[PDB]
Ligand binder design. Sequence first.
Ligand SMILES: [Ca+2]
Length: 879
Amino acid sequence: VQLVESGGGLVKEETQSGLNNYARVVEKGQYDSLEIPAQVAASWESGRDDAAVFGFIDKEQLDKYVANGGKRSDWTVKFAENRSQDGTLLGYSLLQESVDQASYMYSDNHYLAEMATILGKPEEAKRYRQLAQQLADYINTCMFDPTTQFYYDVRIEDKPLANGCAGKPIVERGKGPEGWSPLFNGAATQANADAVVKVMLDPKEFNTFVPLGTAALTNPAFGADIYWRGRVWVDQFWFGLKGMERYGYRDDALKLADTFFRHAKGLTADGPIQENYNPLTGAQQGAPNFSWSAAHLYMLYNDFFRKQNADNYKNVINRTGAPQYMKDYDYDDHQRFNPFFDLGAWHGHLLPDGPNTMGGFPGVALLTEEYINFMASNFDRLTVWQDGKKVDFTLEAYSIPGALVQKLTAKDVQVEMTLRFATPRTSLLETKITSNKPLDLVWDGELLEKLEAKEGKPLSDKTIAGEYPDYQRKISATRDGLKVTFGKVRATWDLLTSGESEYQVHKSLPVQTEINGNRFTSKAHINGSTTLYTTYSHLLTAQEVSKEQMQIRDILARPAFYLTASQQRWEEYLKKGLTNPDATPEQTRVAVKAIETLNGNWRSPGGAVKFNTVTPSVTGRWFSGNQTWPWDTWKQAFAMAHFNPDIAKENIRAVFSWQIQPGDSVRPQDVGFVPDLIAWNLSPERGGDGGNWNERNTKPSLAAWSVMEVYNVTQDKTWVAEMYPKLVAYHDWWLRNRDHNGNGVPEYGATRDKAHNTESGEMLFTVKKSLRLSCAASGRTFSTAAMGWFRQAPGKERDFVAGIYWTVGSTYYADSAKGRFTISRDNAKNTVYLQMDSLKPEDTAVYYCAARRRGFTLAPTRANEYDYWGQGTQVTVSS
Ligand SMILES: [Ca+2]
């Protein structure tokens, strides 16, 4: 007896259009078979990818939810188009008003009124106070649930409730951090706040090992490892504490801060700052050198941590390493080393790991427009020779805020190396050699060969050069050092170069330099103690290569000036930043890690971005170059206000510099909109070749809060005057384009976009193609008896799908197959079929045919009741 399955594999997709067609599919019962690009983008606009509140819940969680009394349809989020009175297409909204977004809008209004007051505009202040009070009434009437004493999003139902609310609170999707958003933002009444704080401090809800995670323990879609449905983020934790303090519970906030300090793993160690924590174990996850984590850790230092010159802070972050791959990635594709970047520069350096890399600063990290890529292991590494024997050194190497230092000590030679940044394109190394005898010096370097590793293991046998033939890396000796030139590479997702970018080495000492393919050696002879100065410059355009030469000449002429400028700027960061007298040494050191992190993620202007900016992570797979987000920015600038206010202001400016103005070429219906993602390269719709520039959605709005924080530390009236109209245009944009029911209470949404609609304005959506599986039986005919389909997901039981039985060919289906799957038989062919329509990712599994010859009383539906099995066939359905 043999059963042979056929017809599996990756299921294909088909694009459809039309909001009317979409509604007909929802009506049919088949919501779960749809992917709508605009709705995916609205989840990006919320800033919480797969939060429970937006309908995201996995199969096993949903089964349990139903077993507890709930319906699967309780997780469906409907979607609508937003049109003006003219009929113009404005965008799209979730049919759901979010309490965190209502509270942000409350804050927007509150801070805008303060700004109008500062600016002597009392009637505008009156408008903004009125809008705030209206929003607070809606939030406290509509979004607060008296039974569960907490806040939730509401649906936009077919008609409003008797009291005017768009719909009932979505209590059944469970509690999340959005519940304390009214407290943080100050919209909550005192009674409602008291109720919320009690839930926050409940050990059954949020008061976990690391408290205030992204879903309460009681949330049906909670998982301790899910980014947005259980894990703890520093922003929402801090919002939580601030909200508590706002309504009289500073004492308890202080207790939670202490808990967090004791339990968040690695806080007092030397690893990079990451994204989030498991609420049960405190284990860390996410991109290293993560800006908004640094920002909120700094704000916690400032507000909540307490006891219960750059030399004082060595090795706060481990910056050692010896990369062997251009993309030497961790498990989540982030660079697994922590290079030192300063001054907004576009290249960075590591400390030598041991004597193998000693005498150099290994792993030149290059920021190639939008990505971080390692160029070399050793590059310009010094070795010292006497009579043809290499001098043996002891290594000591450390980082401090603003510098890398290495000291090499031998019996009769000492070398002291100090690396600091000099301009936003140039770093400067001082190499001080002490010797009473002549020496031969040798510098060596090698460009990397291997492309990609993940967790130290090569992903393939691919080479940099094989993968990117346009890169054309070439080392040349120069007048006063060496350069590496690069070809034009437009690898949208990986590596971006102009064709005119260069990495230049200039030295104060004359050296003779030999190139041997991807290697170089430079030699010089010295007759005793010598100090030399070396500049390293990553230059991204012909104009930059040109402009930097004069600067490079200046740095080599005035090295003491530039080294001192760096040391003193960093003394100012620590002096302004370390303002908590009641902090322990360990807490203070956490603040210094945050300062180093944020200043590392600062980029100088580049390509389309005309201002200094700060990105979520210089080492991040998708967060590097000068890629800038609004949401990350507001948080970054709130904290950078307190230690580097000039870059705080720049960061906010960079984001507003691409705000939509009347007469815009792409989206004139979006005046006041702030794009989700700006970067070096403009989108093709704007005449560039960039793939990251994103205007399909914005992010939640903490812009007024962030601008006001810069005012609270500077009291600069010209700053408020500058920002206030940009803030007003953005505020107004939400009310034109993200308010489907026009009640003045925003929804998360998406813009009209090439990704979202056809030229004529018909909303795009995607459905999977039908897939048919077949099972050819060999040996005994089963048309009298039983044939069935089972499935099993990775590490799960074999679960019944559908069966066909007896002469008459009666059928039976799993509830999850009903409506979608159709089993059938060709008795002549001894073959059974399964037609699978309305597939969804939950259906990914190995599918097995099975058969039973022996008589049965009732149609067999359980694995152990079948007697023959095919080998299985994988079907994959991806989102
Ligand atoms: Ca609304």
